[PDB]
């Protein structure tokens, strides 16, 4: 063949197989992340797996804060994830400097995604093998959830997942939105945790998951403590 092995060249069917391989690179990590939106809150959950006891559990995280009121969860290569996180933080601060107001979540996602496009069009560099999911509150639009992928697609979502169990998780979430009644903050967090736990079969403990939330009442992105996570987990088991 040879139509793979370079991002620039098109297949005879015009598919650009290299970026599709970058999509597989996300699943190679073996972790899953889920994001679900609510009427007044947006949450991100992801597996936290510590391979060795010696590792400091505090340092390992896939949840990062792009700015005070935006948070992200990265899935894929850890290094590419950290690099994209840094680029996102730079883009947000530069937006604030130039335009005088906090970057919208959609525009941040668009900037990061079009950067991913310049990666998937120029020859020498490779697409970053990571996926981003951004959550924030916009005053006009309420909560928001968005996802960047290695291709440059940046579509917004009511709820999403990324990682190895993405298809199972989106099947689960699709059923839940179809039986739409609402999602308050507690139900939002419960839906996220139930989705992740059901698709993985994990039956989590508080250490195994890390959750981050935004709410219209408290717009700042915060990563909940193990105690708060256990509080939500116990509520799930009780009912």
């Amino acid at each position: 063949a040879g139509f793979d092995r370079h991002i620039t060249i098109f297949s005879p069917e015009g598919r650009l197989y290299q970026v599709e391989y970058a999509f597989k690179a996300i699943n190679q990590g073996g972790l899953t992340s889920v994001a679900v939106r609510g009427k007044d809150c947006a949450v991100i959950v992801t597996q936290k797996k510590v391979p060795d006891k010696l590792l400091d559990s505090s340092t390992v995280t896939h949840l990062f804060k792009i700015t005070e009121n935006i948070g992200c969860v990265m899935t894929g290569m850890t290094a590419d994830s950290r690099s994209q996180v840094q680029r996102a933080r730079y883009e947000a601060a530069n937006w604030k400097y130039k335009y005088g107001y906090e970057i919208p979540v959609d525009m941040l996602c668009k900037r990061i995604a079009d950067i991913s496009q310049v990666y998937t069009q120029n020859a020498e560099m490779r697409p970053l093998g990571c996926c981003m999911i951004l959550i924030g509150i916009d005053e006009e639009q309420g909560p928001q959830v968005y996802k960047c992928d290695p291709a440059g697609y940046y579509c917004g979502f009511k709820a999403t997942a990324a990682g190895v169990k993405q298809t199972e998780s989106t099947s689960f979430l699709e059923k839940k939105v179809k039986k739409k009644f609402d999602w308050t903050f507690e139900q939002t967090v419960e839906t996220a945790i139930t989705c992740l736990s059901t698709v993985l079969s994990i039956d989590f403990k508080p250490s195994e998951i890390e959750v981050g939330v935004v709410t219209v009442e408290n717009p700042k992105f915060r990563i909940l403590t193990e105690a708060e996570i256990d509080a939500h987990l116990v509520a799930l088991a009780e009912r």
Partner: protein, 229 residues
């Protein structure tokens, strides 16, 4: 052979085959339809979503470059956005220089020049997207297509994407120059109705129109009203 992989290499029989492959990438893209009515021009495309989870309001396949110009695409979504930003920038440069809204013909020339600019260098790939650029200038409608090759053509009506040949045949059967846009939108949704393989709804399609007023994306309620027929 070696002609297949290189972009700056004419194959034997003189074909730049990577560009043909980019056109094949366009053909895989979703259906898009453009019909130039006497008093307007309608751009329509399917916005079929993988799941209910997708939020339709987040992204649009039909975008305004200017007040009186808008365009739609079939092909690669990221490439579409690169060139839609570049098109908006080119139009604003024209407005700064001449203090007049850019003509549709001039804009399609400039964006096609950009698309050609990309094909020449080996380090870059062609844009795997084609566009239908519609506009109303000088009290006249316009419809244009711009391919990955960097070439542009002027169509009374045409279709891109999946089943574009069959859609074009359906159009040439159904097309009348005397059509008003009220009828032309119906013909466009029918042209797409040929090729969905699904039950079209207000969400599953995105359609926009241009006229003396200018380009606009008619709302989900509007397209529901037109779909009711």
């Amino acid at each position: 052979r070696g002609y297949s992989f290189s972009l700056t290499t004419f194959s034997p029989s003189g074909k730049l085959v990577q560009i043909e492959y980019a056109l094949a990438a366009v053909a895989g893209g979703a259906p898009s339809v453009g019909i130039k009515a006497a008093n307007g021009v309608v751009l329509a495309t399917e916005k079929k979503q993988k799941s209910i989870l997708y939020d339709e309001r987040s992204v649009h396949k039909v975008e305004p470059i200017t007040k009186h110009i808008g365009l739609v695409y079939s092909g690669m979504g990221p490439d579409y956005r690169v060139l839609v930003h570049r098109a908006r920038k080119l139009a604003q440069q024209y407005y700064l220089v001449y203090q007049e809204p850019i003509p549709t013909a001039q804009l399609v020339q400039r964006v096609a020049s950009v698309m050609q600019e990309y094909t020449q260098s080996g380090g870059v790939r062609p844009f795997g997207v084609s566009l239908l650029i519609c506009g109303w200038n000088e009290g006249r409608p316009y419809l244009f297509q711009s391919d990955p090759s960097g070439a542009y053509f002027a169509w009374k009506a045409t279709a891109m994407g999946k089943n574009y040949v069959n859609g074009k045949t359906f159009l040439e059967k159904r097309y009348n120059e005397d059509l008003e846009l009220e009828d032309a939108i119906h013909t466009a949704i029918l042209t797409l109705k040929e090729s969905f393989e699904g039950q079209m709804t207000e969400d599953n399609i995105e359609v926009g129109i241009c006229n003396e007023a200018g380009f606009r994306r008619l709302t989900p309620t509007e397209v529901k009203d037109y779909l009711a027929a």
